[PDB]
């Protein structure tokens, strides 16, 4: 996956945790 704060987005589900669209980063 990516970091638990990696700059994800809406389609980026590469977070082992999840993607926060408020921070555009993973929770």
Compute and round to an integer the Cα radius of gyration of the chain: 7
Measure the N-to-C terminal CA separation of the chain; round to a whole number of Å. 13
Experimental technique, in short, is: NMR
Q: DSSP letters of 1-27?
A: -B-TT----SS---BSS-EETTTTEE-
CA angle, 3 as apex, 10 and 11 as ends, to 5°? 15
Query: How far, in Å, CA of 25 to CA of 27, rounded?
Result: 7
Residues paired with 2 in a beta bridge:
15
């Amino acid at each position: 996956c990516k970091s638990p704060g990696s700059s994800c987005s809406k389609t980026s589900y590469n977070c082992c945790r999840s993607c926060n669209p408020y921070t555009k980063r993973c929770y």
